[PDB]
Structures are given as C-alpha cells and as structure tokens.
Amino acid sequence: SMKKERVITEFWDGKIIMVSPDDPKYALKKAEEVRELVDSELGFQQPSQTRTYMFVSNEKKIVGCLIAEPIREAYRVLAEPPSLHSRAWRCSTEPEPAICGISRIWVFALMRRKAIASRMVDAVRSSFMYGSVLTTEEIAFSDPTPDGKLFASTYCKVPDFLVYNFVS
Amino acid sequence: GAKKDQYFL
Ligand SMILES: *C(=O)[C@H](C)SCCNC(=O)CCNC(=O)[C@H](O)C(C)(C)COP(=O)(O)OP(=O)(O)OC[C@H]1O[C@@H](n2cnc3c(N)ncnc32)[C@H](O)[C@@H]1OP(=O)(O)O
C-alpha cells in the first residue's frame, strides 16, 4: 500500500505533517514544490538530512511550512550601536551548541498571527530528535528576515536568539 | 532583492 501520512500534531484548525528524506517520491516532490514557493516569496532564485514540516489547513491546503536540518553550533545575534544620523547584523563570535537549524519558516500571509509558526516550531522541537524535546536554546534560525527576527525573539523569549547562515 | 538580512561575526 501507499505509505501513511506522518502526522505530528493535530488541531481544530489543521494538522502538522512531516516529510522525511526517505519518503516516497511524490511526497519529496511535494516538499520541493513548497520550498520553491517559500524561496520565491523570500526572493531567492534557486538533501538527505532535511525534514519538511507542513501545517495543513482543514481545506487540505499547505498554509505553513518549516524546513529543518541538523546543525552543531549557532551564534547569538547581538545589538548593533545605532548610527547617529542613520541590512547586516553582527553575532557573537562564541559559537554555542545547537541541534536543529530552522532553515525556512513560512505562513500564508492571510493566516499570519494565528500561531501557525509557533506551533510548527513546537512540533519540530517535539519530533526532531527521537525521545527528546529540544529546548529553545537548542534551535537556531538561518539569516532571519525582519518578520523572522520578530517571530524568533518572541518565540524564544529573548532578543539574542541563535542564528546560523547555512550548512555547507 | 532577498528579504533575509545578513548576519556576520
Ligand atoms: C529564513 O527563512 C529564516 C528561517 S526567517 C524566515 C521568516 N519567514 C518570512 O519572513 C516569510 C513571511 N513571513 C511569515 O511567514 C511569518 O511572518 C512568520 C513565519 C515569521 C511568522 O508566522 P506566524 O504569523 O504564524 O507567527 P506566530 O503567529 O506564531 O507569532 C507568534 C509571535 O511572534 C511575534 N510576531 C510574529 N510575527 C510577527 C510580525 N510580523 N510582526 C511583529 N511581531 C510578530 C508575535 O509576538 C506573535 O505573537 P502574537 O500573539 O500574535 O502577538
């Protein structure tokens, strides 16, 4: 039979599923489609370790996505002295250990501020590492957009949350 | 172009 859909958490307004690298090709192809949509909205032109989490609405539409990947370290984002008479941020030079890199996170614009992103990050923390629940100090975000920095600081409850650029 | 900011040491 056709493989089962991997539901992580379920809610009144949808469910969070996850696509893993070893899943069927139609699933991996759906994950690719969603990543292309997200990169396009971020303004980017164009493997065996990323997991794609999707928030699926009750109408069976993917209205949220979070692409997660293993990492080993990340860096605290720091405050920059403002210029007196007026986009790059500076991070700590001391790396801190981290487990899960949030490479992309996206919610359909008309459904933002409904805790879809927060619940997706909860689902990642609960399912990324078998038998464990990751703390907010074990996750990091890649080069956040302004939206992402506002989300991440609220979610992790600190201004200096963990950041990384990309796993090469 | 891209909406992601740059983050440096
Ligand atoms: C690279 O990709 C990095 C991984 S960063 C990429 C961030 N994604 C984008 O920039 C794409 C477009 N923006 C989005 O998809 C969404 O804005 C997010 C995914 C960033 C947030 O999704 P969501 O809207 O579902 O977040 P929550 O409801 O879970 O918010 C929880 C708390 O986060 C704070 N906050 C969130 N979003 C904020 C925005 N635009 N502005 C200011 N503050 C924002 C809030 O404190 C929010 O709690 P509330 O009770 O709603 O206040």
Residue numbers in the entry:
A (entry chain A): 521 to 566, 572 to 611, 621 to 702
B (entry chain E): 103 to 111
Authors' text:
Eco1 is an acetyltransferase that belongs to the Gcn5-related N-acetyltransferase (GNAT) family. The binding site for CoA is sandwiched between the N- and C-terminal domains involving β5 and α3, while the substrate peptides binds mainly to the central β hairpin and the C-terminal domain including the conserved C-terminal extension (C extension).
Next we investigated the slower but biologically more important K106 acetylation of Smc38, which is represented by our xEco2-K106-CoA structure. The substrate peptide adopts an extended β conformation different from K105-CoA binding but is accommodated by a conserved surface groove created by the same structural elements on xEco2 including the C-terminal loop of α1, the loop connecting β6 to α3, and the central β hairpin. Instead of the C extension, the binding of the K106 substrate peptide to xEco2 is mediated by main chain-side chain interactions through the formation of a parallel β sheet with the second strand of the central β hairpin. At P + 1 from the acetylated lysine, the acidic side chain of D107 forms a salt bridge with the indole side chain of W623 on the central β hairpin. The structure rationalizes the propensity of Eco1 substrates to have an aliphatic residue at P − 1 and P − 2, and an acidic/polar residue at P + 1 flanking the target lysine in our substrate motif consensus. However, in our xEco2-peptide K106 structure the Smc3 D107 interacts with the conserved R621 and W623 of xEco2 on the opposite side of the ε-amino group of the target lysine. The binding of the K106-CoA peptide is accompanied by an outward tilt of the central β hairpin from its peptide-free conformation with W623 displaced from a central hydrophobic pocket by Y109 of the K106 peptide.
